[PDB]
Each structure stands twice: as C-alpha cells, then as structure tokens.
Design a protein around this ligand. Structure first.
Ligand SMILES: CCCCCCCC/C=C\CCCCCCCC(=O)OC[C@H](COP(=O)(O)OCC[N+](C)(C)C)OC(=O)CCCCCCC/C=C\CCCCCCCC
Ligand SMILES: CCCCCCCC/C=C\CCCCCCCC(=O)OC[C@H](COP(=O)(O)OCC[N+](C)(C)C)OC(=O)CCCCCCC/C=C\CCCCCCCC
Ligand SMILES: CCCCCCCC/C=C\CCCCCCCC(=O)OC[C@H](COP(=O)(O)OCC[N+](C)(C)C)OC(=O)CCCCCCC/C=C\CCCCCCCC
Ligand SMILES: CCCCCCCC/C=C\CCCCCCCC(=O)OC[C@H](COP(=O)(O)OCC[N+](C)(C)C)OC(=O)CCCCCCC/C=C\CCCCCCCC
Ligand SMILES: CCCCCCCC/C=C\CCCCCCCC(=O)OC[C@H](COP(=O)(O)OCC[N+](C)(C)C)OC(=O)CCCCCCC/C=C\CCCCCCCC
Ligand SMILES: CCCCCCCC/C=C\CCCCCCCC(=O)OC[C@H](COP(=O)(O)OCC[N+](C)(C)C)OC(=O)CCCCCCC/C=C\CCCCCCCC
Ligand SMILES: CCCCCCCC/C=C\CCCCCCCC(=O)OC[C@H](COP(=O)(O)OCC[N+](C)(C)C)OC(=O)CCCCCCC/C=C\CCCCCCCC
Ligand SMILES: CCCCCCCC/C=C\CCCCCCCC(=O)OC[C@H](COP(=O)(O)OCC[N+](C)(C)C)OC(=O)CCCCCCC/C=C\CCCCCCCC
Ligand SMILES: CCCCCCCC/C=C\CCCCCCCC(=O)OC[C@H](COP(=O)(O)OCC[N+](C)(C)C)OC(=O)CCCCCCC/C=C\CCCCCCCC
Ligand SMILES: CCCCCCCC/C=C\CCCCCCCC(=O)OC[C@H](COP(=O)(O)OC[C@H](N)C(=O)O)OC(=O)CCCCCCC/C=C\CCCCCCCC
Ligand SMILES: CCCCCCCC/C=C\CCCCCCCC(=O)OC[C@H](COP(=O)(O)OC[C@H](N)C(=O)O)OC(=O)CCCCCCC/C=C\CCCCCCCC
Lengths: 198, 198
C-alpha cells in the first residue's frame, strides 16, 4: 500500500541514474575516444612492428625449421634403419625365445591343465558328494525350519490378532476424540490466523 | 497420553518377541548344531582329502615347476646373452650415433641459438620502444582515465549522497511504522503459536 511512496523514491533513483547516464556515459564515450585514439597510436605501430618482425621471424624460424628438418632427416632415416635392423635382431631374438618357450609353455600348459584335468575333476566330483551331503543337511534342517517358521508365523499371527484387533480398535477409539480435539484446535487456528492475516 | 498407550503396545510386542526369540534361538541352534555337526564331519573328510591330495598336488606342481624354473634359468642364460650382446651392438651403434649426430645437434643448436641472439636482442630492444609507446599511451590515457574516473566518481558520490540520506531516511522513516506494524502482527500471531501448541 505504502509501496507507492517507497517506489516513488525509486523513480527518483532512476532519475538520478539518468543524470549519470547522460554526462557520465558521454564522458565515458569521450574517454573511449581517447582509448580508440590511443589504440590507433599503439596498434598502428604494434601491428607494423609485428609485421616487420614476423617476416624475419618466420624467415629465421624457417632457417631453424630447415636445420631441424634436414638434421632430423639425416637422423630419423639412419636411426630408423639401425633401429629396424636392431628391431629385426630383437624380432629374431623374440622368435628364437618365444618359440622354444612357446613349445615349453604348451607343455607347461599340458603339465598344468592335464594335471588339473586329473586334479579338479575328482575335486569337483568329491565336492559334488560333499555338496550333496551338505544339501541333504540343509534340506533336513531347512524342511524342519520351514515347519518351525510356519509355526512361529502362526504364533506371530496369533500375537498379531491382539494388535490388529483390540489395539487397532483402541487406536480408533483414541483417534476419534483426538481428531475431534485437533479439529477444534485447527478450526480455531484457521479463524484466528485469518483474522490477523487479513 | 497417546504415546503412553502406543509405547505400551510396543512393550507388549517386545515381550512377545522375547518369548518368541527364546525357543527360536534354541530351535535355530538345534538345527544349526545338526548342520554344523554335519559340516564338521564333512569338513573332516573335506580337509583331510584336500590335504592328503594337496600333497601329490603340490608335489606334481612343484615337480613341473622345477622343470619350469630350471628350463627358464637354462634358457635365461643364452637369452640374457642375446640381450646383452645384442644390446651391446645396439647401444654401441647408438652411442656411435649420439656422438656425430650429437655434435651436429650442438652445432645446429649453435646456429639455432646464435640466430636467436641476433634476433631476440633487437626484437626485445625494439619491443622496449613499442612497450614504451604502449606505456606512454597508457600513462597519458591513464592520466585522463583517472581524471575522468575521479569526475565520474564525484558525480556518483553526488547521487549517492542524495540516496544515502533522503532515500535512506524515507526508507528508515517507513521502516518505523512498517517494523512496528510487523511487530504488532508478529507479537499477536505469537499468541496463536503458543495457545495452539500449549
Ligand atoms: C543501477 C546501477 C546503480 C549502481 C549500484 C551498484 C550496486 C553495488 C552497490 C554497493 C556495493 C559496493 C561496496 C564495495 C566496497 C569496497 C570497494 C573496494 O575497495 O573494493 C576493493 C576491495 C579490495 O581491495 P584491497 O585488496 O586493497 O583491500 C583489501 C585489503 N587488504 C588486501 C589490503 C589488506 O574489495 C572489497 O572491499 C570487497 C567488497 C565485497 C564486495 C561487495 C559488493 C556487493 C554488491 C553486489 C554483489 C555482486 C555479486 C556479483 C555478481 C556479478 C554481477 C556482474
Ligand atoms: C603471430 C601471431 C600470434 C598469435 C596472436 C593472437 C591472434 C588471435 C588468434 C589466436 C589466439 C586467441 C585464442 C582464443 C580462442 C579462439 C576461439 C575461436 O574464436 O574459435 C573459433 C575458431 C574458428 O572456427 P571457424 O569454424 O569459425 O573457422 C573456420 C576456419 N577458418 C578460419 C580457419 C578458415 O576455431 C578454431 O580456431 C578451432 C580451435 C578449437 C580447438 C579444439 C581442440 C582443443 C584441444 C586441445 C587444447 C588443450 C591443450 C592442453 C595441453 C597443455 C597443458 C599445459
Ligand atoms: C623391440 C622392437 C620391436 C617393437 C615393436 C613395435 C611397436 C609398434 C607396433 C605395434 C603397435 C601395437 C599396439 C596397438 C594396440 C591395439 C591392439 C588391439 O587393437 O587389440 C584388440 C584386437 C581385437 O581383435 P581383432 O580380431 O579385432 O583384431 C585382429 C587384429 N588385426 C586386424 C590386426 C589382424 O586384438 C588384437 O589385435 C590382438 C593382439 C595380440 C597380438 C599377438 C602377437 C604378439 C607378438 C609378439 C609378442 C611379443 C613379446 C615381447 C614383448 C616385449 C616388448 C618390449
Ligand atoms: C507367514 C504367512 C505369509 C504367507 C503369504 C501371505 C501374504 C503375504 C504377506 C506378507 C509378506 C510381506 C510383503 C511382501 C510384498 C508383496 C506386496 C504385493 O502384494 O506385491 C504384489 C506385486 C505384484 O506385481 P506383479 O503382478 O507384476 O508381479 C507378480 C509376480 N511375478 C512376476 C513376479 C512372479 O509383486 C511384487 O511387488 C513382487 C513380490 C511378489 C512375491 C509373490 C510371492 C507370493 C507367495 C506366496 C503367496 C501364497 C501364500 C499361501 C500359502 C498358504 C498359507 C496358509
Ligand atoms: C513383529 C515385528 C518384529 C520385527 C523383527 C525383528 C527385528 C529385531 C528387533 C528388535 C530386537 C528386540 C528388542 C529389544 C529392545 C532393546 C535392545 C537393546 O538392549 O538395545 C540396546 C543395545 C545397546 O545400546 P547401544 O549400544 O545402541 O547404545 C550405546 C549406549 N549409550 C546410549 C548409553 C550411549 O543396542 C544394541 O545392542 C544394538 C544392536 C547391535 C548391532 C547388531 C547388528 C546385527 C546385524 C544383523 C542382524 C543379523 C545377525 C545374524 C548374522 C550372524 C552371522 C554369524
Ligand atoms: C575343497 C574345495 C577347495 C577350496 C578351498 C579354499 C577356500 C577358502 C579360500 C581361500 C583361502 C583362505 C586362507 C585361510 C584363512 C586365512 C585368511 C588370512 O587372514 O590370511 C592371511 C592373508 C595375509 O594377510 P596380509 O596380506 O595382511 O599379510 C601379508 C603381509 N606381509 C607382507 C606383510 C608380511 O590375508 C588374506 O589372504 C586376506 C585377503 C582377502 C581380502 C582382500 C581385500 C580385497 C579388497 C578389495 C577388492 C575390491 C573389490 C571391489 C570390486 C571389484 C571386483 C572385481
Ligand atoms: C624451438 C625448438 C628448438 C629445437 C632445438 C633443440 C635443442 C634444445 C635441446 C634440449 C632441450 C630439451 C629439454 C627437455 C626437458 C628437460 C626436463 C628436465 O630438466 O629433465 C631432467 C630433470 C633432472 O632430474 P632431477 O630429478 O634432478 O630434476 C627434477 C628435480 N628438481 C626440480 C627438484 C631439480 O628431470 C628429470 O630427469 C625427470 C624426468 C621428467 C623429464 C622428462 C623429459 C621430457 C622431455 C621433453 C618434453 C617435451 C616433449 C615434446 C617434444 C617432441 C617434439 C616432437
Ligand atoms: C609455435 C611454436 C613455436 C614458438 C617458438 C618460440 C621461439 C623461442 C625459441 C627458443 C627459446 C629461447 C628463449 C629461452 C632460452 C633461455 C635460457 C636461459 O637463459 O634460461 C635462464 C634460466 C635461469 O638461469 P639459471 O640457470 O641460473 O637459473 C636456474 C635456477 N633454478 C634451478 C632455480 C630454476 O636457466 C634455466 O632455467 C636453466 C637451468 C634450469 C633447467 C630448466 C629446464 C630447461 C629445459 C627445458 C625447459 C625449457 C624452458 C624454456 C622455455 C622458454 C620460453 C620462452
Ligand atoms: C506450530 C508450528 C511449528 C513451527 C516450528 C518450526 C520452525 C523452525 C524452528 C527454529 C529455527 C530457528 C532457530 C535458531 C534461532 C537463532 C536465529 C539466529 O539469530 O541465527 C543466527 C545464526 C548466526 O550466528 P550468530 O548471528 O548468532 O553469530 C554472529 C557471530 N558472533 C558469534 C561472533 C556473535 O544463524 C546461523 O548460524 C545460520 C543462518 C545465518 C543467517 C544470517 C542472516 C542472514 C540475513 C538475510 C539473508 C536471508 C535470510 C532468509 C532465510 C530464508 C528463509 C526462507
Ligand atoms: C602425448 C603425446 C602425443 C604425441 C603422440 C605421437 C604418436 C602418434 C602415433 C602414431 C604415429 C602417427 C604418425 C602420423 C604421420 C602423418 C602426419 C600428417 O601428415 O598428418 C596429416 C594430418 C592431417 O590433418 P587435417 O586436419 O589436414 O586432415 C584431417 C581431415 N580434415 C579429416 O577430417 O580427417 O595432420 C595431423 O594429423 C597433424 C599434423 C602432424 C604433423 C607431423 C609432426 C611430426 C613432428 C616431428 C616428428 C616426431 C618426433 C620424432 C623424434 C625422433 C627424432 C629426433
Ligand atoms: C527495507 C530496509 C532495508 C535496509 C536494511 C538495513 C539493515 C542493516 C543491518 C544489517 C546488515 C549487515 C551488513 C553486514 C556487512 C559486512 C559486515 C562484516 O564485515 O562482518 C564481519 C563478519 C566476520 O567474518 P569472519 O569470517 O571474519 O569471522 C566470523 C566471525 N567470528 C563470526 O562469528 O561471525 O562477517 C560477517 O558475519 C558478514 C555477514 C553479513 C551478513 C549479510 C550477507 C549478505 C546478504 C544478502 C545480500 C545478497 C543480495 C542478493 C540480491 C540479488 C538478487 C535480488
């Protein structure tokens, strides 16, 4: 309601801002004119300075690039050749190493896997009997536990009857007057709050 | 009142739970004993068979492992020799490359750096002139910037004071009845808060 009075001061604030938006911004533009003029005194020389330097720079760089490229060509080629022969020697080494070791590894695998074929096979079979006996134990006690659980579930359901019936009715018998009392407190609160929030 | 009866049902449940857990832990343990006894008997054969068989298992594996290690060491010697002799050539030939190609690198680096010296020296010197021009403009423009900024700041301070006092006093003057009316509503609303929760 009184916001009009407060906002009126905001309008005055806008006016004060507009006063600055004029000469201050205009002055800023005048400063910008100095900035642009300055840049036209800096960049004018800078750009030419760059051009007059980039040319010999790229030229000197080209010289260095040439030195590097030529030097690298006279290095990469012979080195690659030597590395190739060295790699071929390494390859031959690898071949002459991985071949006997490969055959050996295959026999190693034979001696290991065939061993496993005669180690894990009876092991799994033994485990099968062991697991079977264990399964029977789990089924014996499990089947009993199922009966026990069913009995306990029955006891639990029976002990739940005294909760889902009398206790639930008791809760309902409590909820009725409670909700009523809550309603009285809520209704009054609603009116009371509305009266002060109007 | 509600909590008293509700919690009563809780204790009337904990008791039943305790009366249930009693035989439950026993029945569970009885079944657990049957299982664990069987597991023990089973584990007796399990561990014994595993240990009795682990002996020839390890013996078989170690036997082959001996061959694996022996043949490995047997071949490791000539293989290491191939690596050593081969590397001797590879490294020696490379050392014979790092020498001339290294000298060439240094010689190329000489021209590389020396050409850089004859370029970077005047480049940085001329850059000093460029930077001088930049700094000159930055100083001259800066002097204006600061002068204008001071002017703009003064203009800002003028409108600032026109708001820090008149507008602020308007706000503060309004804050008086506003805060008071708010206090009136808050203090009165506080009645409901207490008369509804106690
Ligand atoms: C319609 C347009 C109208 C114009 C209205 C503009 C609205 C903003 C209005 C008022 C707030 C300004 C108050 C700031 C006063 C400080 C000025 C100052 O002196 O400042 C520089 C100093 C640091 O200098 P120092 O190292 O020498 O001092 C530290 C000392 N030690 C190193 C030396 C030992 O810093 C400090 O005081 C730190 C101050 C903390 C900054 C508070 C700013 C609060 C305002 C807005 C929040 C902005 C969030 C940003 C969102 C992005 C928007 C684009
Ligand atoms: C001698 C002179 C010296 C230099 C002086 C300054 C001059 C100004 C120029 C460059 C420097 C400013 C850089 C600011 C970024 C620019 C963004 C921008 O303006 O972009 C747009 C451009 C153009 O695209 P277009 O389609 O319009 O033009 C079509 C192509 N037309 C032009 C070629 C024919 O886009 C591009 O140039 C594409 C680039 C996007 C790159 C993507 C991949 C980034 C990967 C890795 C970076 C991280 C490295 C980190 C590792 C180091 C850790 C220490
Ligand atoms: C010392 C001097 C020499 C140094 C060597 C020069 C280094 C540079 C050379 C090669 C770079 C290799 C790295 C690339 C990585 C990606 C591998 C990849 O893409 O992997 C996934 C594929 C998927 O299968 P696919 O059916 O789609 O591909 C069929 C392959 N296709 C189409 C080619 C027939 O799998 C494959 O390519 C299967 C890969 C299995 C490779 C088996 C042969 C291994 C040979 C020798 C053993 C060496 C022992 C010595 C080690 C010592 C080193 C110091
Ligand atoms: C101690 C006495 C208790 C014995 C049972 C009596 C009532 C169960 C009471 C309490 C259990 C605790 C809460 C379990 C949560 C289930 C809520 C429900 O209602 O979930 C229905 C939705 C249906 O969704 P759907 O149609 O897409 O899936 C159909 C399923 N299909 C694709 C997967 C195979 O399923 C789901 O959320 C996923 C779960 C579906 C599980 C169904 C297993 C029913 C097993 C036995 C019922 C027969 C009891 C009779 C035995 C004689 C007793 C004297
Ligand atoms: C029909 C509806 C029935 C619902 C289903 C049954 C759920 C079981 C529910 C309730 C149990 C019976 C109620 C007994 C009530 C009182 C228990 C008690 O006296 O409470 C207090 C204790 C100790 O007080 P505090 O240390 O907390 O306080 C620190 C002390 N102060 C506060 C001074 C700083 O609290 C403790 O002992 C906290 C327990 C310790 C954490 C045990 C973690 C168990 C994990 C998994 C369960 C599976 C076990 C089987 C797996 C075994 C494999 C070998
Ligand atoms: C007939 C049928 C045959 C089957 C029979 C075999 C089944 C039983 C299985 C295994 C044999 C159990 C061994 C007997 C019990 C003793 C357990 C124990 O205590 O033995 C002691 C070891 C050593 O102790 P230490 O190393 O400290 O001492 C070494 C420190 N020295 C350097 C300082 C001196 O302890 C250990 O072996 C404990 C290591 C286990 C915990 C590893 C932690 C893994 C953590 C993270 C993995 C990431 C999961 C994330 C998801 C990724 C999935 C891919
Ligand atoms: C314009 C172009 C001109 C062309 C002309 C060429 C001639 C110039 C010649 C050589 C300059 C290349 C220098 C390479 C970088 C050396 C880094 C370094 O100082 O290294 C040795 C140090 C000493 O060890 P420290 O533990 O005592 O020192 C660390 C402990 N503190 C800090 C406490 C003292 O650190 C180590 O050895 C630790 C290992 C980490 C360093 C790995 C070396 C990485 C090399 C190059 C990176 C760039 C690859 C890209 C280039 C490829 C282009 C195709
Ligand atoms: C588009 C792509 C192409 C662009 C081309 C750009 C053209 C520029 C071309 C070539 C570079 C010329 C300019 C740089 C050469 C100046 C060398 C110099 O005179 O350096 C002086 C320094 C300081 O003197 P000090 O040795 O007594 O103090 C060291 C004291 N302490 C240990 C505490 C760190 O010496 C040191 O740092 C040396 C001792 C410490 C070792 C540092 C590692 C050096 C190796 C590799 C890293 C390279 C850094 C060079 C990057 C330059 C960027 C401009
Ligand atoms: C029947 C229906 C049932 C109703 C029941 C439910 C209601 C919830 C109940 C209670 C919650 C509030 C209780 C806490 C009372 C303390 C309030 C207070 O005075 O707390 C101030 C503290 C800050 O410490 P200090 O001032 O004492 O120490 C100053 C430093 N020394 C120590 C050197 C002096 O606060 C802090 O730590 C944290 C907050 C910091 C805030 C500072 C003020 C910022 C101002 C404006 C920004 C906007 C705030 C608006 C929030 C949005 C709301 C939607
Ligand atoms: C973290 C490390 C990252 C580096 C990883 C390197 C390993 C690479 C893996 C395998 C070898 C690959 C070897 C590849 C050699 C081929 C180099 C070449 O000519 O590449 C052509 C490309 C072409 O790019 P374009 O953008 O023109 O084309 C793409 C096209 N539009 C599209 O949509 O697909 O340009 C490029 O990719 C970029 C320019 C490269 C210039 C060459 C520059 C080479 C410079 C120097 C030589 C190398 C150093 C040797 C040192 C030994 C001597 C002392
Ligand atoms: C209608 C009338 C309006 C006029 C009202 C006038 C009332 C003025 C009264 C009080 C204003 C208080 C103005 C305080 C200004 C700064 C005051 C200041 O420097 O305080 C110093 C403290 C000290 O910090 P330290 O870290 O040094 O130590 C902590 C200290 N020991 C402790 O226990 O707290 O730091 C603090 O606690 C600072 C937290 C300040 C909280 C504000 C934090 C900023 C909160 C909000 C601003 C965000 C605005 C977002 C708007 C954008 C979208 C619209």
């Amino acid at each position: 309601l009184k916001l009009l009075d407060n906002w009126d001061s905001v309008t005055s604030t806008f006016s004060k801002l507009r006063e600055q938006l004029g000469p201050v911004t205009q002055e800023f533009w005048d400063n910008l004119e100095k900035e642009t003029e300055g840049l036209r005194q800096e960049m004018s020389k800078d750009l030419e300075e760059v051009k007059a330097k980039v040319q010999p720079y790229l030229d000197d760089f080209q010289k260095k690039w040439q030195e590097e490229m030529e030097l690298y060509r006279q290095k990469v080629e012979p080195l690659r050749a030597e590395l190739q022969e060295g790699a071929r020697q390494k390859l031959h080494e690898l071949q002459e190493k991985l071949s006997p070791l490969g055959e050996e590894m295959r026999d190693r695998a034979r001696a290991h896997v065939d061993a496993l074929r005669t180690h894990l096979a009876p092991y799994s079979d033994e485990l099968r009997q062991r697991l079977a006996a264990r399964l029977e134990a789990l089924k014996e006690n499990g089947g009993a536990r199922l009966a026990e659980y069913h009995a306990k579930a029955t006891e639990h359901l029976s002990t739940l009857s005294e909760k889902a019936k009398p206790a639930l009715e008791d809760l309902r018998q409590g909820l009725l007057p409670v909700l009523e009392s809550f309603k009285v407190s809520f209704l009054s609160a609603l009116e009371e709050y509305t009266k002060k929030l109007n």
